[PDB]
Amino acid sequence: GLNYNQEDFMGLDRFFQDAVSHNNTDANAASSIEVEMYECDCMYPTFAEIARRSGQPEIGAMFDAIAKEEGMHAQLLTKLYSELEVKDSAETLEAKRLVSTIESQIDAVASDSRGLRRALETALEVETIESQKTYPAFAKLAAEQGNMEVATAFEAIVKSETKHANWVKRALENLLEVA
Ligand SMILES: [Fe+3]
Ligand SMILES: [Fe+3]
16 A cells, blocks of 8 residues: 555645534634634635735635634624633644745745645645534533533534534535536
């Protein structure tokens, strides 16, 4: 065989960040807020710039639209936990550093067709994990704990992240269709 799994081109897969599981729903909300704001603030704007600089403005507009919706998810949870003090974990700080190293190479990243391909594939990876695993698990726990309002919020976030996965897949299919 190859003898190893190659890491993705330019480390773009490490843009994906997952919320951390806890026993307590306030802490799951805090972790979600953290990650969703990182995607709103940092991840998706960077993907949008890769798209634009690759000559793909429509896909860039999609990433800008998704970014705003990640902020909506965070703001719903903030409304429910008004007093929470959310801080970036080590892993979010590392991801923000990575974002800044791609920004300072943005021209090279975009000029290679893998830049945008891997950005879309990383978006798909997070939207998949969020929609199918992480936020269903948070919704289930919140319900178990009798926290109906927060369970309902996570169920709405699940719906939205599922939509994003669909958007991203359709965009990937078109990106890769030349004609
Ligand atoms: Fe998200
Ligand atoms: Fe999303």
